[PDB]
């Protein structure tokens, strides 16, 4: 921290959040900054690094960013009432339940017609170990060293390669980018004046299986990004092979180095943005509902059964599930199957020019 | 700074400077990294904070920026072979000098129809307080303040007023740069990099006289930066309108509240970037050279000169290179001097005339 700060009143250092449009900008007040301004986590997670990111750009949502697990604690003040709006309700007395058996997940095959992918995105950070805002490089290189290696003892068809971004040449870089599976210099502001972007590509790296359908991120956001992904509508399979990766690799960082996933009762998974608490997971699948994109309750019928949904390319639309933290990683994997197969119900009926008003809530 | 850091052996905190082609990836061996690693400055800057500009990239030529006024004595190790490679051979052993005697200027007016406009900047630190890459938004305010208040004492001609960057619109704030007067908005990799463009735009704006022939940048790369400009090429007088606005700009902070600018016997004044140490002057003029563009000796020529050159019509931006060793005064009639040749250089190659007689030797 810059030890000139403390000789000063929190007063002239207290942030003008005019024209800011974030939670940061609404729930820390005078008073809350002036009380946590000197204070710092164990590893030395200050709170303006915790808030550069919002000071920084008025209109990112939430614009806080935390360093290290401690942050969610010592800055509870600001965290709480901003995880409890994001999270519709979620109370710093409520706790978080992570169930990620896979036996649990509803064996419905979507339609291949309506269903083109299914998907699976999680993240993980590694407990004891500073965030991406904070890491050093030490640690970051530590990370990738007991990351990739768990990955590469993988095998049968979780068998795969890992690449390091560093020294990485032009055919390798344009074979990953062609697979979507590339990500680069990290020239967002997001994460410029989040300290996420320091020493690139020192300890980033990415890995895949030989089948494709398994993809890991190495220390960006998260010190993991874990993605399960494949054509069609069997969401089940997609979570199966999901959860058997997680299981594998945390059992080889458990063992070989004693660590596993920064994680506790009352948040669940440790992220470092706090819209990714709890579960982390984003289960989406690419259905194609141009009927229901013309009707105007689309909205409101995804809200109810805790979905959202996201146009992309005609009438393709991505359904995934709305909550994070507060439901488990089945309830909401079971949420975007059983609620993706009311949509493409409603989605025939409009095909033949029926009501769907005997399926929409009340 | 990450307390968990001192933990790791040094070596697997060591950047990995392959590829680079910085004076950082040359002078920061692995065993000085290991020694300087967990040793902070009295304010808390470290050694990561002040190499993380070069490290982030590797095309960059220094590499390192300060925190504050200790970063220069308590990482000399690492700064100081830098500092003498890039100013010459400039030791830790040799010491800068200062002459802001403005009679001393040559009193030649360079040629208006080549010299479009000439400006005299320079970089000015308060002492006891952080530099752009470690400073809280408190010690930006104060320095805002304290700043901004003694330029508003400025009379007649000097006589302006402060303009937060907070306040002006868009539009006002594009036309100053457009206009060469306004600083660029900090979203270049180095701004980015070295920790520069934290809160902006909390505490900075720019300061000028209704003429505007005399301006201050408040807290981008350095506190202050004072410029003086105007159309034409009468470079003594554009520095006679810098060195009195410089000078009374410093008593008033001063008298105020007792605050100078750094500097020591050795470096002259502190600038953030090692680039910038001795006077921190950047003399300069927007020429029009298209023959000299055309010519494969005219960098050459510019660095016997002692000068820099960067274009965008043949139009560039002559400075001088030197800043550390040598004065103000020599500076600028280094450009005077140089320009000088150039602009007669010119003259002749429009009339498919000799110009080797003219090359330095
Ligand atoms: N002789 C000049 N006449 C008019 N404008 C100039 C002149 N020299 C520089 N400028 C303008 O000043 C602005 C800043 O220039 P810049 O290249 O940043 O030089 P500087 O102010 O010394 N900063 P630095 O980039 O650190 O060297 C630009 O918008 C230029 O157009
Ligand atoms: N103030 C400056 N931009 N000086 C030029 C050099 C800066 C550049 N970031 C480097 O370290 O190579």
Known sequence: ANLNQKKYPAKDDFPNFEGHKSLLSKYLTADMYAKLRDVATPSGYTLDRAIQNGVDNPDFHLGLLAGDEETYTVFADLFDPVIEEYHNGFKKTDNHKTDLDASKILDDVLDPAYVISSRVRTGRNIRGMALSPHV???????????????????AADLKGKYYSLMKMD????????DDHFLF?????????????ARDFPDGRGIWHNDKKNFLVWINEEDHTRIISMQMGGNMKEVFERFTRGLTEVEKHIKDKTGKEFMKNDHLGFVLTCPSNLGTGVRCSVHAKLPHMAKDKRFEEICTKMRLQK?????????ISNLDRLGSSEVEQVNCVIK?????????????????????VPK
């Open 310 to 318: 996201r146009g992309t390319s005609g009438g393709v639309y991505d």
């Open 184 to 196: 680069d210099r990290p020239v967002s502001r997001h994460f410029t004046s989040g300290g996420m």
């Open 136 to 154: 050093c490089r030490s640690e970051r290189r530590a990370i990738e060293k007991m990351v990739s290696e768990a990955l590469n003892s993988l």
């Open 339 to 359: 609620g993706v197969k009311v949509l493409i119900e409603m989605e025939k009926k409009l095909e033949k020019g029926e009501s769907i008003d005997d399926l």
């Open 170 to 177: 032009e055919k390798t870089q344009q074979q990953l980018i």
